[PDB]
Nucleic acid binder design. Structure first.
Ligand SMILES: [Zn+2]
Ligand SMILES: [Zn+2]
Lengths: 60, 385
DNA sequence: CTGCCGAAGCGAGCACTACTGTCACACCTATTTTAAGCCCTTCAATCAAATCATCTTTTGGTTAGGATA
């Protein structure tokens, strides 16, 4: 729910979802080709990749 | 009922209606005369009580249900000669050594290490403002009849905090203490404020420093409101006044922001007696739409004959915290009157300049702008505190 | 002294998913052995946020380098 300026969330955290998806899918591609994903639950890896994106678009 | 009690020890008390509280106080004092503003007789040595004996012994006998001789015996027994260890001709500047007090021992310990040439002085003890504004007004009476405090009138002690908080300490606060009457309205309290927020100015005038704005904030905006027990008291006497509380009620009531439902009312519709307010519990006042003030009802009591009976001074300031002047960075000793941004000459942004350090640095003899910078007139809150 | 047949109001037919008597076969767990991955706790080693002690930058007042009015 970070793509909408809901009152429950400050607008500081709102970002375009397109760049979000691009950053996340390339991050998880990096994770995949580095043997991280094999034999493990993907969901936590996707969550971590969304994390690295979300911090990367505004480390400020 | 309106029975004051401590909500927390020595920090805040329960809420009660000021009018009902004053009525209860008067009911326990009306007719007795202890709440009157006339000078009563004072205690004296037994060697001079003969003059007051005729007027005092009968009343004492009536009130104590004892005989007149018993009243005289009580008066002679309770004479001040039994209590006055100090003669009336003794100065208070020297500790009497003929004492067994631990308090005076600690006082001697304090005074002994302050008698050296490096330490001996008659400087401030811990503060100065309180006594200076007490003696200036305590026991005085007005020059006009209309400025007379009503006998038994409530006296309310209100602390107003400054907009410039230390944001480094939390025990003590920057505030000034205002004394107001129960019958007074909130309008006369609001109009008596001399906060620097009323004097704010702006405008960028690096090109023409002499074209500073003509109107101070007080001449452009007049919005001000109090806030007690969930009620906003907004000024509307002038077109410049706006009901700021409507925006707050729109923002806060749309979500569970941690505060309850509020109500809107005008500023002149209530007196201090109409309030149902706590003592010591902070409250909110605002003016100019961005200058909020913390409001603490520190004390409330009936008027006494020895108090300041002169209403021309009311609202009467009795205590005030100090703010330090914002001095410019050029000479590092003079209070700034200008602030600049994007200044190529200044080592930091923002930079504070005084008129002397500003005009000749940023302009030549003809007043032509020198270098690249933006300049704004500045009013020091530490000066107009 | 008993009996026939009208007047008006009723009615029809057309418009290029609830239990019970059984029954055998599922459900169920007695343990062995891996190979990488498991959830929760639980304390210990390392870390970093907040607070205290002290040097130092500057804001009101005294001193003797320093000065007018
Ligand atoms: Zn203010
Ligand atoms: Zn200057």
């Amino acid at each position: 729910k970070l793509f909408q300026a809901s009152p429950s969330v400050p607008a500081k955290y709102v970002e375009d979802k397109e760049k979000m998806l691009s950053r996340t899918m390339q991050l998880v591609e990096l994770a995949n080709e580095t043997w991280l994903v094999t034999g493990r639950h993907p969901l936590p890896v996707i969550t971590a990749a969304t994390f690295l994106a979300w911090q990367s678009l505004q480390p400020a | 009922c309106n029975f004051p009690e401590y909500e927390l020890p020595e920090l805040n008390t329960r809420a009660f209606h000021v009018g009902a509280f004053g009525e209860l106080w008067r009911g326990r004092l009306r007719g007795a005369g202890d709440l009157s503003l006339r000078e009563p007789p004072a205690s004296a040595l037994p060697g001079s009580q003969a003059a007051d004996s005729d007027r005092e012994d009968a009343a004492v006998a009536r009130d104590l249900d004892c005989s007149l001789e018993a009243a005289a015996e009580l008066r002679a027994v309770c004479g001040l000669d039994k209590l006055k260890c100090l003669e009336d001709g003794e100065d208070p500047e020297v500790i009497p050594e003929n004492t067994d007090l631990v308090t005076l021992g600690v006082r001697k310990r304090f005074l002994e290490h302050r008698e050296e040439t490096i330490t001996i002085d008659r400087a401030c003890r811990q503060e100065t403002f309180v006594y200076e504004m007490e003696s200036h007004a305590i026991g005085k009476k007005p020059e006009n009849s209309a400025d007379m405090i009503e006998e038994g009138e409530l006296i309310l002690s209100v602390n107003i905090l400054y907009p410039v908080i230390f944001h480094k300490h939390k025990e003590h606060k920057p505030y000034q203490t205002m004394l107001v009457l129960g019958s007074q309205k909130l309008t006369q309290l609001r109009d008596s404020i001399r906060c620097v927020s009323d004097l704010q100015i702006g405008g960028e005038f690096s090109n023409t420093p002499d074209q500073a704005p003509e109107h101070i904030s007080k001449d452009l905006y007049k919005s001000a409101f109090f806030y007690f027990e969930g009620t906003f008291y907004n000024d509307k006497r002038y077109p410049e006044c706006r009901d700021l509380s409507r925006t707050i009620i729109e923002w806060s009531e749309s979500h569970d922001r941690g505060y309850g439902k509020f109500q809107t009312a005008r500023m002149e519709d209530f007196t201090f007696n109409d309030l149902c307010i706590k003592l010591g519990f902070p409250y909110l006042y605002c003016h100019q739409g961005d200058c909020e003030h913390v409001i603490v009802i520190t004390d409330i009591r009936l008027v006494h004959h020895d108090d300041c009976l002169d209403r021309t001074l009311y609202p009467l300031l009795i205590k005030k915290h100090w703010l330090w002047t914002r001095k410019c960075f050029v000479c590092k000793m003079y209070t700034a009157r200008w602030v600049t941004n994007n200044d190529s000459f200044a080592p930091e942004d923002p930079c504070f300049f005084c008129d002397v350090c500003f005009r000749m640095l940023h302009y030549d003899s003809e007043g032509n702008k020198l270098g690249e910078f933006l300049a704004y007139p500045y009013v020091d809150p530490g000066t107009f505190n």
